[PDB]
Amino acid sequence: AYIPNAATEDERYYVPFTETVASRPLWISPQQNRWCDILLAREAGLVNRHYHPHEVFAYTISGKWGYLEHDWTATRGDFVYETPGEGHTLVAFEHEEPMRVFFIVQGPLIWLDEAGNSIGHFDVHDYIAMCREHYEKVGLGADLVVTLFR
Amino acid sequence: AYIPNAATEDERYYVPFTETVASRPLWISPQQNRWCDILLAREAGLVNRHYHPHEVFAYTISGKWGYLEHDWTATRGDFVYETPGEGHTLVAFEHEEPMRVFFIVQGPLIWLDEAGNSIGHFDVHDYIAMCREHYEKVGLGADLVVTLFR
Ligand SMILES: [Fe+3]
Ligand SMILES: [Fe+3]
């Protein structure tokens, strides 16, 4: 698979995930419960506390972001590996550029509690569904998502 | 793990792989036989034909490169997924910028024949050895490699 201009300026390609953060799917494996994507926050953003059962890798393209549970913040060019089992809250700061991050995500995400409990999930089927749905609405066609399968 | 400025200009961090192509290790898993790295070619470059038993993901940072066995060439911003089992020859063109590519590699690589045979291998132990060795020589210390383990 070859996707030119992955972190495109074309807003249509980005699927809302939370209210402030969206992603462009690049590669999805329903069988492996795994996906690559560009994570985008045009403004201040937050992704709720969750943990992955497995690793996460990120390479930062632009903006400034990090997780509240570590001391670093990542800007253009910085690499991040999250250790499996880590509960974390992603945040994005307002920077000259939107936040854009290349991610390889081995799902599910388990949403965590204010407390510390499992309170919801996000797996690859949830991801395929939201992306198909958005791509139908914006006129990229639901079937463009199917093009990303492997 | 957080590595600032992964695709650094500091040449010392890059470990020669072929004569024209080098990589900076970013994350290495001896147990999973898997690693992330920045692949760099300052000039024209070539990596000999080989196949991975598993997937490869790449996000292109700068330069222009591709595989002889596909029709695309990848420049700044382009994403690539190589399907597992694919035999391929990586090439890098001379561009305004060096080639720099963020890779997640599930090894081993099996070197292939002019013909089409398995004729050599490259696994994570080979990678750890070459990186330790180079990092000792350049004065980043062999032990900096151990810092990359997970
Ligand atoms: Fe996460
Ligand atoms: Fe390869």
Residue numbers in the entry:
A (entry chain A), B (entry chain A): 27 to 176
Question: What does the literature reporting this entry say, word for word?
Answer:
The enzyme 2,4′-dihydroxyacetophenone dioxygenase (DAD) catalyses the conversion of 2,4′-dihydroxyaceto­phenone (2,4′-DHAP), a breakdown product of lignin, to 4-hydroxy­benzoic acid and formic acid with the incorporation of molecular oxygen. Whilst the vast majority of dioxygenases cleave within the aromatic ring, DAD is very unusual in that it is involved in C—C bond cleavage in a substituent of the aromatic ring. There is evidence that the enzyme is a homotetramer of subunits and its sequence suggests that it belongs to the cupin family of dioxygenases, which have β-sheet structures and are known to play key biological roles in metabolism, biosynthesis, oxygen sensing and DNA repair. As a bacterial dioxygenase, DAD plays an important environmental role in the aerobic catabolism of aromatic compounds.
The structure refined at 2.2 Å resolution establishes that the enzyme adopts a cupin fold forming tightly associated dimers with a pronounced hydrophobic interface between the monomers. Residues 60–132 of DAD form the core cupin fold which consists of a double-stranded β-helix forming two four-stranded antiparallel β-sheets that are a characteristic feature of this superfamily. Interestingly, in DAD both of the sheets are actually six-stranded owing to additional β-hairpins formed by residues 40–55 at the N-terminal end and residues 135–148 at the C-terminal end of the cupin motif. Whilst the electron density is visible right up to the C-terminus, the first 26 amino acids at the N-terminal end of the protein are not defined by the electron-density map at all, suggesting that they are either disordered or have been removed by the chymotrypsin that was essential for crystallization. One important and intriguing feature of the dimerization interface is that residues 28–30 form a very short region of β-strand (strand N0) which takes part in the dimer-forming β-sheet of the cupin barrel of the adjacent subunit. The catalytic iron is bound at one end of this hollow by three histidine residues (His76, His78 and His114) and what appears to be a carbonate moiety bound to the iron. One O atom of the putative carbonate is approximately 2.0 Å from the iron, suggesting that it is datively bound. The same O atom is within hydrogen-bonding distance of the side chain of Tyr93 which, like the iron-binding histidines, is an invariant feature of DADs. Instead, carbonate does fit well, has a high natural abundance and is known to be a metal ligand in a number of nonhaem iron proteins such as transferrin and lactoferrin as well as a substitute ligand in some dioxygenase mutants. The modelled carbonate is located in a position which is highly likely to be occupied by the α-hydroxyketone group of the bound substrate during catalysis.
